[PDB]
Design a binder for this molecule. Structure first.
Ligand code: NI
Ligand code: NI
Ligand code: NI
Ligand code: NI
Lengths: 227, 237, 237, 227
């Protein structure tokens, strides 16, 4: 680490955790609790460095109770060790889904604005067919497949092969998620996307996709929190 | 496929490849060469379906020499098998470069948008240091490395791990490319002016001006790569 | 040499090696073994002159088997040729370790004296970071590397390039040693307490207290190495 | 580089060079002059980073005149490029000799305090013989050899072989220097060293050696400056 970064981190930890000195005999417990709470409510974000001497100084204690607080946080999967970083706050259970959906919004918005201008009658008919099959489908495994196919039909004229490979990969991952989880967790948005693609209303279609994916990530994260 | 698409592909293949029936003993060699020639000169574009029976029919041969031909093409990386499509014509290196840079513009612009508002004094100090090393660097190997570290410095606060893996993959690929090709590109003396502009705009947290500058920088990159690859194809290197 | 030194060496060699005259066909093997045994058990100390005629005389043989013997010893690194001295008994690994650590105490203490008053906030931040990485490190390879970087951090403002080359040579040698041997040393769980103390004293610019702590740290190092090497010699590893 | 280090360097460059903005047309010349003078008189020590943008900001100019000032400094050998550092102030011609003698003082002081306690009559006689031969020697190549031999005779009982190898190496380097340079550039100090070693006055002997080597480095650096 670097001096300015280190001092900025120390100021940040103080603003989030405070600087009250616990009794020596309460230090192990009090520090674990304050760290856990700050981690769980997001005020100490993932990737924040958890340095024994920085925390011992902040709280006016020896390193040992900090070290033993950090050990329990790791047992609880709230901290992990990374190479060149030491102990850092671990990602919350929703983080990867947030990242995944953010990336899909970036990639698919681009696939959609390349494809819409070029979609032909055959593309638009295949898309209509997939939504129509979605309307009457009851099998949860078939729902994930058809939703995938629908979204892929809108990207049928995306003319960047590297982009498309990443797009498919995200859609495959989503299908796998829905096949295994949708049981345990509405075509109007799909029709709207189709209507806007038919009209070649490119950015309105993209905006509609972003809204659709942002509802998706909210449903996924809510479900992961549920467990 | 359906009757219309099939039929259109068959007429198209005839227009590009003709329909002389080679003798049996020459069918594989004749067909491998016609398809390779047509792929390389762009007349059979990437994504074209290469179907054994369609091609056997066109050339008046059996599937066997067509299948052998297409295996040689796959071994040369001029065709790839894709699920639901079969054997299709693969993108050539120039098309792949064009798609690669378009994707880096897409990915790196978002990285910049996310990172710029959060960059700390150490990030900015690191970036300046790398440009300063670029200013006095003479080894070509080191130029690729220092260039990559500069761009990574500006993305240092991109807190999407999935996005950053793709951004880094792209930067590593560039570095590897420059590592081997830069001394053959003949670009002359290089200037740090663009890097300094990128850093200045990053420092001021001028986010869209910075994105615009990166888009210029990357579009000059793909133009340079593209020109080089055509030189290399022509044998003018 | 002169008559007295020669004569004393000759009596000494007899006291250590005896004087049985081996048969000709066994002279080389007998002599190589007696000298090697006596070198390894310390009874012929490092720096002892090994002179062909003196040894031929003692054993009642010709110079040839003595010369062959001494060549085998040189090939085993148990003797070295030095200018003005000839073939002398080489230091064994334990003596060499003892001399190496004494020299690091000498060199590193001066490095610390020169560097401590000048260390900047980035130097101190780097040092803390390395100890913090040592605290949570489980790979033995990485422990040697992180240990070396910590010590180098404290010497970061030693502005004598000749001294620093020797200091770095010593630290690289330690790292290389730990890289291969640490997992076999059985030292148990290791503590960062000494490193933190060194940094604390460096931060306060308590120069002689810091030197004293480093001297303790290095003397525990040579004791550990020495014990390990004897284990290794005994075959108790 | 790191943020705090960079800002400390910027403050340092300002205290040494000032911050007066030259006319655009004088920038190239004025900056070269101020840098050269600060380098030659030691106020910008060797290893100081010379960063085009830092200097352009300091002087309120564009990078080009700084870049062209730095290029002339390099032509004059006052700056050199180092890996991971960029352009740095180069060592002055006396720097390596200062380093060499500093290191000899460290190593030889230790050889001397290991050896003096153990020196015997034969050692002390060999040492006396070398000084006596130095007193009557007129050949400059023989003077360097005998001075070496004298100093080695005092280290005859140094019982660290690694140390001794470094010591010999420094003495060899000195002998080579004196063989080639002494022409173009006094046994009382030698006798004093011998007298103190005879008495086993260990630290006084070491102090006397340090004084001897510090006069040596002063003569060597003075001569290098002369050219
Ligand atoms: Ni959907
Ligand atoms: Ni660049
Ligand atoms: Ni250590
Ligand atoms: Ni002298």
């Amino acid at each position: 680490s670097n001096a300015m970064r280190k001092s900025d981190r120390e100021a940040f930890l103080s603003s989030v955790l405070g600087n009250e000195q616990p009794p020596a005999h309460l230090a192990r417990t009090v520090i674990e609790e304050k760290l856990r709470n700050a981690i769980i409510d997001g005020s100490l974000p993932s990737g924040t460095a958890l340095r024994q001497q920085e925390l011992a100084t902040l709280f006016g204690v020896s390193r040992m109770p900090v070290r033993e607080a950090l050990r329990q946080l790791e047992a609880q999967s709230l901290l992990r060790v990374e190479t060149h970083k030491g102990a850092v706050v671990a990602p919350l259970i929703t983080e990867d889904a947030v990242d995944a959906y953010a990336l899909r919004i970036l990639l698919e918005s681009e696939a959609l604005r390349l494809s819409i201008p070029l979609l032909d009658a055959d593309d638009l008919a295949a898309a209509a067919s997939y939504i129509e099959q979605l309307e009457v489908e009851t099998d949860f495994g078939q729902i994930g497949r058809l939703n995938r196919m629908f979204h892929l039909s809108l990207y049928a004229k995306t003319h960047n092969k590297r982009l498309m490979r990443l797009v498919e990969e995200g859609l495959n991952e989503e299908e796998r998620f829905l096949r295994f989880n949708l049981s345990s967790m509405s075509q109007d948005d799909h029709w709207q996307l189709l209507r806007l693609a038919e009209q070649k209303a490119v950015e309105p279609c993209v905006e509609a996709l972003q809204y659709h994916l942002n509802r998706g990530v909210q449903a996924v994260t809510q479900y992961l929190q549920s467990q």
